[PDB]
């Protein structure tokens, strides 16, 4: 009976498709603006389907108007960028396109759970709420746990030790300026300063992890010729899976903030918490030194979430 | 400690990759002749494996011999048809491609066994025989799932059922002169013939499945812009499964027939098992009019052949 | 949101459970009439579902108004057969059990769809459909599933196959009047026939595997000095899959007949459909002969089930 | 090709085999010394299989050397505990079925893997290890990860959040000297510190649920009226798969200490990682405060299993 | 030990600052740009509280840094209109004056629950929350608790009953668009509709009552020559009364919109609960006609609001 509507039929919400398919986790709408492509990869998806015994319903569609009562509306529609380019040039076009987006979402289905992966993120997701009128809980971007999985990946692989259990926060934008905290990283349990106690990793080595963290994206895009695809659609589908299951994990990603963090009134990068009711903030104690980076962090996200809105017109 | 190596990064590698790594089948190697798109999407993987709990390892290069002992091999190394191209006007650039990886597997890992999928499917099977020099059992092409799929898909579609057990068998080549078989079509064992007597699907109905079934593959690329990615990716992990598993499960595939449905000497679509020791054909009771549909289907399956490997000189 | 309640916390409903919580469908309820039994078994399952990464809510309980809700409901209460006993022989127990538990459906959660275990399976689906006031469409049982599973087990040993696609129609009373078809049983879509024909198997091996099917049930007790769990759970969880995400499978189960195979106002082993909506029967055109026997099935399912409601009193 | 050997065909020995089947991680065959129930356990594993759509090879049997070749072994041979005993009353008869299991394995396959789970936990191991001669890489029990998994369940249940992501470190015996640290207690990353000072949670209400997860084990034998089944089976599976799949995940279980936590020459529970080559201790700074405890908990087993060598005379 | 602060030192704060005196409410912050004012102004209030045996704190200061630490904000700083004038001509004034004192509440007591008096009401409390950076639960403005007293008041006088027990709900903005609901007016419980069917009130006398509401700040400005003070201050009291002392009361007030009655992400007159964490906003079931009414009023408040935001740059 569960509705999920991808608007957007890139490589991003097919591979989220193709995961949602796999848990069952809903029916498929697969939405674009270019005729014939969604159609095209729902053929595909229902022959995948098939092949692997999952037995849900998949349209591709056309009209907009499909969306009517989506449970859950996952947002990849605009441009994604190029090598040389920061997330950050493509705010003129993609504003527009999230502005658009967030009127259809308006008047075809306002209770559903909104996940904005268009770029810049934090920024794009605060267009989203501007437009759509929706409640803020119900409406997220995700990147955290891209990120968090990237610096993880890499941690894990320094200490010769299984990414499964290897935990970590980073918050602020998705952007050069994310916070990763190794206070809040632990593998299964065991905080990342006892690593550096027993001489298994080092300070530089942690700084230079961050950094690639940090350089990621761009870095897969140079190597790859194109963004990546299939860790941004596993993250998403672990926020629907949050959301769908009222499981209450608590992730990183874009969220309201409202006086957490010294905030207020932005979508940014932070702690949450997603279940049944949508995105959660939570406040956790940070360092003064800690606090200030976030709140850097913070101000380009408002600086940039400006210039969109400045922009839009 | 099992090792599937992917000959060719594209779309179905990389699909290939995610769905070996979310049923923790084996450790990747992903190989392709363009620099830096192996690594690029191993990086992308690795990510996607660090999200979901899976901790196989991932390798991207461009070295060939990196394919040392994989217990699997998968090449979709080849270029794709487009817009009104048929498979077959790839035979020139494809058969040399295929010939060029055939001798890198001779010499690099003999042992491996060896799902094709480059277009035109059956072709190129027989070319990758002829200059690999590894027996006949331990080479196939992945075909004959993806078609049934497709027409097992439209048959559940028109009885309003379940695709989930819906079987059939598809003889011949992938392409214009494949012979689905209603007496080899099935629902939860029910057979076909008995949905026509209970006039819940027509002779006509039928027909018109079987057409579209055939042209699928066309319809996909005219929509999407791109052709299939997500099924055939499900139908190649299908087989992996098989042989790394021993199942011993019945399929159609594109495997050495030796006396079977009156041919020898060709690779060509068939029933066939995939256990532990490779792929194995099947022969089953055709009627005239069934083995005559099958036999014609042969016949340019042995011509397209023929002018392969002409080409290749 | 899904809430599954599972009357009865032996064996059968445990496993149920957790095969529920693998694949995320529900919250669960778990109802015993004897105190402490589901409140530890929910500890047990919290602890499983901590480990593998199952978040779903999971209550043990002894107030049967907790079922409250329901939108599924899984009947294993009463008591088991031992060696030496028929499943006829619980029919004087299990019935005033049933009774009981349709009636707390009956104030509780008239909403349910109730998937009816407790043996004799075929007579207390009856009961329960008498004193439970549902639709009898929202009522089934599972069987045949489990005995198609077994048959399809030995078929697929015998041929040198795997069983994943080896599927059977078996008609009538879960007991030692099965009616296992031949004519609907396939080996990936081609018929078993075609086999008797290419002689790998042989009409006398069959009948032998016709028997082993029957009394399967009993020669597990004998064997394991307990009756058979993992296999009816998994079949349960099938038809639970099936409901809940509409799929509309066609398998053979206990369904409401209603002019079908000659026979009206019983609820028996059939061909029938799970969707939405509940369990729908499907008539397929037999033979003389295959209803002869199909009748001879119903009939003792009457007499029984007459037997059943006289001993209620 | 992967075997695993499960000796011992009770509750947890099924459960596990259930499991490893689900995740096709081997053939297994399931060995116990009472006649006919491991076949019969094994029919009913086959069915669960064949509607699952799993096909692994399953043998029930009552000859040991059977277990020849095995890769993986899981010993869940013994007596289990009733209401008001303690797993050390079991030391007597299990020490005794451990050592002829031990000489079994030593000239049956004496290259296998070893997953003690027999109680007295800590203990059994040790006997295995005297009498077994494999190398103390190869043998380990499993405990610490079901400890682990009740704290933490007990931990996000008070916390209000998924348990998906709590991770927590325990220390020593599988008994009542068991050492949770709070230190190496993580939600997400974030230390269980924090959520302290957040008030979230008090010093107190973690004392409570150190006592509950000590006692949880018996609470279940006094509620269910039978010992937890579900969760050492999942704890086993996690152990297996970090073992076939060279995860190096990083566990607490009985391991062979050297040097590591003032300790050498004993099995107890401790920090370790499994892979390939098998378990592994890994020592991590503890406090004094810390330390003494485990040291503690450490004496019982040293004086313990001495108890136990000298019963088994 | 409770600190209210008054940001605005005119006729309205002072009366608020004396009604808390009376009711023992807290420590009074009497704060004004203007020197001597809130001094001299204090020095009544002490003696005012010494004739009346009240012993609180009050401070009258032009340093708003004295406002740190208030758990209580009251803000009527800005200028009031005069005869002819709408409260939307003071947009441009107010706008600035209101963004400044958010600045200030920003760094000195970001803590504080704050209630904005300065018209026009809705459109200053959108202003402060833009430039406060205070969670939306923490501001407030008061407006609809002193329309509705005018209307109950009329209502009482002309069913000849007390007014003590009339109550009602009057959504919308603090304008002419005010939206009086007579479905949600009763008289110590009985609704309206009970008094108009008994002939004690007329429709069209209800109707020129609504309007005598919605011009009766005009008509006590042209009457009095100065704007309302002692009603505006006892309704502030009574929110500042809920707030201290978690009564949960529900009122009409300026509260944030999200997502409920078809508004998201701005401050508009709405039903809503005050308590110790703020003022919440509650939804009822509004028909077609009056939801209508309401989405006028929300407009207008839409408007106006964007228009502040501009004439702020």
């Known amino acids: ?53 999952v037995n849900r319903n998949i349209l591709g569609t056309n009209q907009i108007e499909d969306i009517k009562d989506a449970d859950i509306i996952v947002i990849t529609a605009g441009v994604q960028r190029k090598e040389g380019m920061t997330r950050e040039d493509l705010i003129g076009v993609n504003g527009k396109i999230m502005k658009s987006v967030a009127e259809s979402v308006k008047l075809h289905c306002s209770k559903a759970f909104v996940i904005c992966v268009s770029n810049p993120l934090d920024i794009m997701v605060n267009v989203f709420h501007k437009f759509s009128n929706l409640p803020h809980e119900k409406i997220c971007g995700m990147a955290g746990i891209l990120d968090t999985s990237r610096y993880c990946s890499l941690i894990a692989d320094k200490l010769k030790v299984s990414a499964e259990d290897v935990n970590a926060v980073i918050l602020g934008g998705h952007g050069d300026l994310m916070v990763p905290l190794q206070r809040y990283t632990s593998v299964n349990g065991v905080p990342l300063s006892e690593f550096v106690k027993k001489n298994m990793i080092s300070q530089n080595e942690i700084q230079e992890i961050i950094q690639k963290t940090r350089n990621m994206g761009a870095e897969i895009i140079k190597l790859a010729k194109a963004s990546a695809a299939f860790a941004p659609a596993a993250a998403i589908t672990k926020m629907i899976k949050s959301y769908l299951y009222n499981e209450n994990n608590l992730f990183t990603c874009a969220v309201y903030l409202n006086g957490h963090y010294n905030c207020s009134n932005l979508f940014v990068g932070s702690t949450a918490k997603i279940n049944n009711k949508g995105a959660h903030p939570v406040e956790f104690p940070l360092t003064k030194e800690e606090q200030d980076l976030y709140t850097e962090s913070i101000a380009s996200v408002q600086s940039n979430t400006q210039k969109a809105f400045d922009l839009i017109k």
């Open 1 to 53: 009976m569960t509705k999920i509507a991808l608007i957007g039929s890139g490589q991003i919400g097919a591979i989220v498709g193709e995961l949602c398919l796999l848990e069952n986790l809903g029916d498929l709408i697969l939405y674009d603006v270019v005729p014939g492509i969604p159609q095209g990869k729902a053929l595909d998806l229902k022959h995948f389907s098939t092949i692997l015994g």
